[PDB]
């Protein structure tokens, strides 16, 4: 039988281009395909209708690109119906109302009563490409009450919407907010805050930097901290600093009055130590072990000798730990294939959350399998699983030399067996060389097959699909000859894979009791976070004689052709006062990656779980399909 199967993303978005992949396995000649998208359940309107032909030259695999209009709080669904020849396959897919993304940029981080707030709203879609839509904007006071609403258009604005709001003289101090949302999706609200306060700009900056990014609880030296004060124009600072320490437990802060010190700031630098004794005496608990899990914060006040300027700065979130490292399995699949090599992507970080470079890690009992973390703090550990249905429990430890075993980090995870169709023991395993991947390179994707020889010759190809930013970027086939256990796919990596992509490949056959079987496997691949194009601002003249108040200067801007660039110049004193809510690229990619429909590093409990967890819906004519998804958000709340 010429089995017809369709795959469409778990969730379909409105006003967004969505792709649908169509397959006709075990078929000959041309197969006419007509795809129609209707609303659920009434089918009142035909939301989409495209056509295509499956020819033997295209290996009976084609696609349909369609965009569902935003037609005029329970979840909403649509019926996707593909018709090949006589056969008709329909599937009910969940729909998100989210039109895209909105990013807000205010010129400053803090404002005086009377000043004007200049802000730009960037309106893009899920491909981060500029669109022209209607946006609702709300100015909101610290209490939460909206004080100015507005409704503008992004059309003919090249995805950039320049706005301003005047702050009254009489105003409520505190954290104000701007909240914008697309007109069609009032449930997706993007926000940015800005502080309102009476202030004057400082003339220098103070930096509170501890020796270590953490504090080992059994360190008699205590927490040593360096204070560095320097003017905003570069020159160092002579003065006096008042430094004081405190212990933070969740949201409860306990100041340590005994730890207060006054030190001279000579040549823009000073040093001050919180002794372990003072720390322990301050808290009413002799058990130092209880301090683990809590953090330390440092507050420093620097005064110039002239007494004409003063700057207070703080460094919080300094974890009290018993280990310099911290192991995470947030990038390692929680499902394994019995009898096949199980790959682990260990993620080792410092107590402050930063990645750790060159850290020896190993599995308990398997000292042979000892790897080293990369620049992203990710190491690869492959083990060998025995054929069984017992849950595979793994315990990984750090093996950093010069470090005692009591201070080595350790973590334990568990993985469940990949259930197969009718206990046929047919497995597929995707492995990838673990290394920081960049656009413009090529990645070798290793397809490893396992099955009995009774039906091993039937497998002639794999169907692989790629998910990026929550949509299908690329789909194709991988030819496999009978006898070959491992084949390599040379995948060309471009900028469309940023920030990360999922590769889910599967094969189908007719085996055992004449049953139609589908075996799938997916893997998550991270990519070096960056801009799609590029944008650099540098000096447009001969260096390096420093400019003068009023002096003309040339600015060299280098970016993508035709691009509209928006600018802002801000005094760093502002940042000495407030350095929060600043728009970066990392935050953009953060939002994008958090709006991903995939919920796992790879694989699933069954062949349907692989598709569902990787944000996909598979539906065959024989009846093999993934369960419905009624949750817009990933597990768990």
Partner 1 sequence: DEDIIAEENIVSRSEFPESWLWNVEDLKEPPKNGISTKLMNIFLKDSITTWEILAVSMSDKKGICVADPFEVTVMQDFFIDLRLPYSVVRNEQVEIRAVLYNYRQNQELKVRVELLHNPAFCSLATTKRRHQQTVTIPPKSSLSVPYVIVPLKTGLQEVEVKAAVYHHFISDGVRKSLKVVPEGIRMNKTVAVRTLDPERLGREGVQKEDIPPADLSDQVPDTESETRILLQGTPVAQMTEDAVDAERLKHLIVTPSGCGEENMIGMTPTVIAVHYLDETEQWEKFGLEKRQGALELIKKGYTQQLAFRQPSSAFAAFVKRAPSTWLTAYVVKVFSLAVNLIAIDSQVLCGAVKWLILEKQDGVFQEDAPVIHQEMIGGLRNNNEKDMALTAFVLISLQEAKDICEEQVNSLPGSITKAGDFLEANYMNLQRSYTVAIAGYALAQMGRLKGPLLNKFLTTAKDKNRWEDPGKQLYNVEATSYALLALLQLKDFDFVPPVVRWLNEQRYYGGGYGSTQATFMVFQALAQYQKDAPDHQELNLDVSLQLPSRSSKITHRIHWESASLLRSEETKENEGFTVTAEGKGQGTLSVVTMYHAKAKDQLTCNKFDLKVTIKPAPNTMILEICTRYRGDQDATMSILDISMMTGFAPDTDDLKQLANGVDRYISKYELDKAFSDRNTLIIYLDKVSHSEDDCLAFKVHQYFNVELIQPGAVKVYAYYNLEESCTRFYHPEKEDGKLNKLCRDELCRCAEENCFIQKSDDKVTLEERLDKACEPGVDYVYKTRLVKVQLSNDFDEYIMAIEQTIKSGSDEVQVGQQRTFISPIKCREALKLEEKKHYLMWGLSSDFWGEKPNLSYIIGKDTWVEHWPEEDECQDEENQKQCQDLGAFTESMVVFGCPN
Of residues 379-408, which lie at the interface with partner 1 (CB under 8 A)?
none
Residues near 116 by beta carbon (within 8 Å), at least 6 away in sequence: 164, 165, 166, 167
Total residues in contact with ligand NAG, by rule CB under 6 A: 4
* CA dist 91 → 14, 27, 418, 611, 628 (Å): 17, 22, 25, 14, 9
Residues near 17 by beta carbon (within 8 Å), at least 6 away in sequence: 65, 66, 67, 127, 471
Helix H or strand E segment including 104: strand 101-106
Q: Which does residue 301 bind out of partner 1, ligand NAG, none, counting CB within 5 to 8 angstroms by kind?
A: partner 1
Determine the interface stretch with partner 1 among 346-354, 378-386, 452-460, 553-561 (rule: CB under 8 A). Answer: 553-561
Q: Report 50-109 residues binding partner 1 (CB under 8 A).
A: 74-75, 77, 90, 92, 103, 105, 107-108
Q: Which does residue 454 bind out of ligand NAG, partner 1, none, counting CB within 5 to 8 angstroms by kind?
A: none
Q: Report 580-599 residues binding partner 1 (CB under 8 A).
A: 583-585, 588
Among 50, 224, 309, 593, binds partner 1 (CB under 8 A): 309
Among 508, 529, 506, 526, smallest CA distance to 458 is for 508
Length of the chain: 637
Among 63, 112, 138, 188, binds ligand NAG (CB under 6 A): 63
Q: 121 or 430: whose CB is closer to partner 1?
A: 121
CB of 305 to partner 1, least distance (A): 5
- C-alpha of 54 from chain center: 37
Among 202, 179, 195, smallest CA distance to 113 is for 195
Q: 143 or 251: whose CB is closer to ligand NAG?
A: 143
Among 28, 86, 198, 220, binds partner 1 (CB under 8 A): 198
Beta-bridge mates of residue 431: 446
Q: Phi first, then psi: give them for residue 167, nearest 5 degrees.
A: -90, 125
Can residue 170 be called a binding residue for partner 1 (CB under 8 A)? Answer: yes
Buried/exposed code over 134-162 (b: 16+ C-beta within 10 A; e: otherwise): ebebbbbbeeeeeeeeeebebeebebebe
Can residue 206 be called a binding residue for ligand NAG (CB under 6 A)? Answer: no
Among 330, 481, 569, 636, binds partner 1 (CB under 8 A): 569
Can residue 533 be called a binding residue for partner 1 (CB under 8 A)? Answer: yes
Among 548, 633, 635, 637, binds partner 1 (CB under 8 A): 548
Q: 179 or 213: whose CB is closer to partner 1?
A: 179
Among 57, 200, 406, 454, binds partner 1 (CB under 8 A): 200
* CA dist 221 → 216, 225, 276, 296 (Å): 10, 11, 7, 15
Q: Which two tokens stand for residue 37?
A: 């998208």
Q: Report 4-23 residues binding ligand NAG (CB under 6 A).
A: 19
Can residue 129 be called a binding residue for partner 1 (CB under 8 A)? Answer: yes
Distance CA 290, CA 428 (A): 47
Q: 23 or 517: whose CB is closer to ligand NAG?
A: 23
Q: 63 or 420: whose CB is closer to ligand NAG?
A: 63
Q: Which two tokens stand for residue 616?
A: 């996909």
Q: Which does residue 305 bind out of ligand NAG, partner 1, none, counting CB within 5 to 8 angstroms by kind?
A: partner 1
Q: 436 or 560: whose CB is closer to partner 1?
A: 560
Q: Are 136 and 150 in contact (CB under 8 A)?
A: yes
- Tell me the Ramachandran region of residue 259: left when phi exceeds 0, alpha when psi lies from -120 to 50, beta otherwise: alpha
Q: Which does residue 461 bind out of ligand NAG, partner 1, none, counting CB within 5 to 8 angstroms by kind?
A: none
Pairing of strands 215-216, 310-321: parallel
Q: Which two tokens stand for residue 598?
A: 């995939």
> Which of the 8 DSSP states describes residue 422?
G
Q: 458 or 474: whose CB is closer to ligand NAG?
A: 474
Determine the interface stretch with partner 1 among 188-196, 208-216, 396-404, 555-563 (rule: CB under 8 A). Answer: 555-563
Q: Are 355 and 380 in contact (CB under 8 A)?
A: no
Site string for ligand NAG, 465-494 (x = CB under 6 A): ---------xx-------------------
E strands present in 97-222 = 101-106, 110-111, 116-124, 134-140, 146-153, 160-166, 174-182, 190-196, 204-210, 215-216
DSSP string, 307-327: SS-EEEEEEEEEEEES-S-EE
Q: 375 or 533: whose CB is closer to partner 1?
A: 533
Determine the interface stretch with partner 1 among 158-166, 332-340, 459-467, 470-478 (rule: CB under 8 A). Answer: 158-166
Q: Are 129 and 172 in contact (CB under 8 A)?
A: no
CB of 303 to ligand NAG, least distance (A): 31
Distance CA 482, CA 459 (A): 7
CB of 471 to partner 1, least distance (A): 14
Q: 234 or 365: whose CB is closer to partner 1?
A: 234
Buried/exposed code over 225-255 (b: 16+ C-beta within 10 A; e: otherwise): bebbbbeeeeeebebbbbbbbbbbeeeeeee
Q: Report 453-492 residues binding partner 1 (CB under 8 A).
A: none
Q: 339 or 439: whose CB is closer to ligand NAG?
A: 439
Q: Which does residue 210 bind out of partner 1, ligand NAG, none, counting CB within 5 to 8 angstroms by kind?
A: none
Can residue 128 be called a binding residue for partner 1 (CB under 8 A)? Answer: yes
Among 13, 25, 127, 429, binds partner 1 (CB under 8 A): 127
CB of 33 to ligand NAG, least distance (A): 12
Chain residues in the site for ligand NAG (CB under 6 A): 19, 63, 474-475
């Amino acid at each position: 039988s010429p089995m017809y199967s369709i795959i469409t993303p778990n969730i379909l978005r409105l006003e967004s281009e969505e792709t649908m992949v169509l397959e006709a396995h075990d078929a000959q000649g041309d197969v006419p395909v007509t795809v129609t998208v209707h609303d659920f359940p009434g089918k009142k309107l035909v939301l989409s209708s495209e056509k295509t032909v499956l020819t033997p030259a295209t290996n009976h695999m084609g696609n349909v690109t369609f965009t569902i209009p935003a037609n005029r709080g329970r979840n909403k669904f649509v019926t996707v119906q593909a018709t090949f020849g006589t056969q008709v396959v329909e599937k009910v897919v969940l729909v998100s109302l989210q039109s895209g993304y909105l990013f807000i940029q205010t010129d400053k981080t803090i404002y005086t009563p009377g000043s004007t707030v200049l802000y730009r709203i960037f309106t893009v879609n899920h491909k981060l490409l500029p669109v022209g839509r209607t946006v609702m904007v709300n100015i909101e006071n610290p209490e939460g009450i909206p004080v100015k609403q507005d409704s503008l258009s992004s059309q003919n604005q090249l995805g950039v919407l320049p706005l301003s709001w005047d702050i009254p003289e009489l105003v409520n101090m505190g954290q104000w907010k701007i909240r914008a949302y697309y007109e069609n999706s009032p449930q997706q609200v993007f926000s940015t805050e800005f502080e309102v306060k009476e202030y004057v700009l400082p003339s220098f900056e103070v930096i509170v930097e501890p020796t270590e990014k953490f504090y080992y609880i059994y360190n008699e030296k205590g927490l040593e901290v360096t204070i560095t004060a320097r003017f905003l124009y570069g020159k160092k600072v002579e003065g006096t600093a008042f430094v004081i320490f405190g212990i933070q437990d969740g949201e409860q802060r306990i100041s340590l009055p005994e730890s207060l010190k006054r030190i001279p700031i000579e040549d823009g630098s000073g040093e001050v130590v919180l002794s372990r004794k003072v720390l322990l005496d301050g808290v009413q608990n002799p058990r130092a072990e209880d301090l683990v899990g809590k953090s330390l914060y440092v507050s420093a006040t620097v005064i110039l000798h002239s007494g004409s300027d003063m700057v207070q700065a703080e460094r919080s979130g300094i974890p009290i730990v018993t280990s310099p490292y911290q192991i995470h399995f947030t990038k390692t699949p929680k499902y394994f294939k019995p009898g096949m090599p199980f790959d682990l992507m260990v993620f080792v970080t410092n107590p402050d959350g930063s990645p750790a470079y060159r850290v020896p890690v190993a599995v308990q009992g398997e000292d042979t399998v000892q790897s080293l973390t990369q620049g992203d703090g990710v190491a690869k550990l492959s083990i060998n699983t025995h054929p069984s249905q017992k849950p595979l429990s793994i315990t990984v430890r750090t093996k950093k030399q010069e470090l005692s075993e009591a201070e080595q980090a350790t973590r334990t995870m568990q993985a469940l067996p990949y259930s197969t169709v009718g206990n046929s023991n047919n497995y597929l395993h995707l492995s990838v060389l673990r290394t920081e991947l960049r656009p413009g390179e090529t990645l070798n994707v290793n397809f490893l097959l396992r099955m009995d020889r009774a039906h091993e010759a039937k497998i002639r190809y794999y169907t692989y699909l790629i998910m990026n930013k929550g949509r299908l970027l690329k789909a194709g086939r991988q030819v496999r000859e009978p006898g070959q256990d491992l084949v390599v796919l040379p995948l060309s990596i471009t900028t469309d894979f940023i920030p990360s992509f999922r590769l889910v490949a599967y094969y189908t056959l007719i085996g055992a009791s004449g049953q139609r079987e589908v075996v799938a496997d997916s893997v998550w691949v991270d990519v070096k976070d960056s801009c799609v194009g590029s944008l650099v601002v540098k000096s447009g003249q001969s260096e390096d004689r420093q400019p003068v108040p009023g002096q003309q200067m040339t600015l060299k801007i280098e970016g993508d052709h035709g691009a509209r660039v928006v600018l802002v110049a801000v005094d760093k004193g502002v940042f000495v006062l407030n350095k929060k809510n600043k728009l970066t690229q990392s935050k953009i990619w953060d939002v994008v990656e958090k709006a991903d429909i995939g919920c796992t590093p790879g694989s699933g409990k069954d062949y349907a779980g692989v598709f569902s967890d990787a944000g996909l819906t598979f539906t065959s004519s024989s009846g093999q399909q993934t369960a419905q998804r009624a949750e817009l958000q990933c597990p768990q709340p």
